[model samples]
Target: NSKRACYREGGECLQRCIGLFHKIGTCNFRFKCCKFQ
Candidate 1:
């Protein structure tokens, strides 16, 4: 899963990560983000 794919999924998990010092300001995860997708 790519960065585009993550946000493309939808929902909070897919939304930009508002946790800690976010570098990308998103859930910056590939396979982890699209675990179900």
Candidate 2:
């Protein structure tokens, strides 16, 4: 369910998430819910 949210918006699965963002779901697939905001 949460996994789908990533694509619904514009998320990214970075290696090591930097800047201001938290784990919205899984993509380890690691989903970056707030990729560019």
Candidate 3:
């Protein structure tokens, strides 16, 4: 239940966004999945 909810509710998505911010050195980049909230 938790595993499925994590992906469905975007919990993992936030982690991905955090990863991107570090990788890119900024949070200004646009992404299709950026409307995560």
Cα lDDT tens digits for candidate 1, 1-37 = 3346446645344343333422322455531332331
Off by over 4 Å in 1: 1-4, 14-26, 29-37
- Which regions of candidate 3 are displaced past 4 Å? 1-4, 13-37
Model 2 RMSD, rounded to 1 decimal: 3.3
For each candidate, what is the lDDT? 0.39, 0.57, 0.31
Candidate 2 residue-pair clash tally: 1
User: Model 3, range 1-37, lDDT digits (tens) per residue?
Assistant: 3223233433322335643432222222343222322
* Error at 30, model 1, angstroms: 14
Q: Top TM-score: which candidate number?
A: 2
TM-score of each: 0.21, 0.40, 0.18
lDDT value, residue 30 of candidate 2: 38
Cα lDDT tens digits, model 2, 1-37, are: 4346666655777667666765465453433444656
Give candidate 2 misplaced runs (Cα > 4 Å): 1-4, 20-23, 28-33
- What is residue 36's positional error in candidate 1, in angstroms? 11
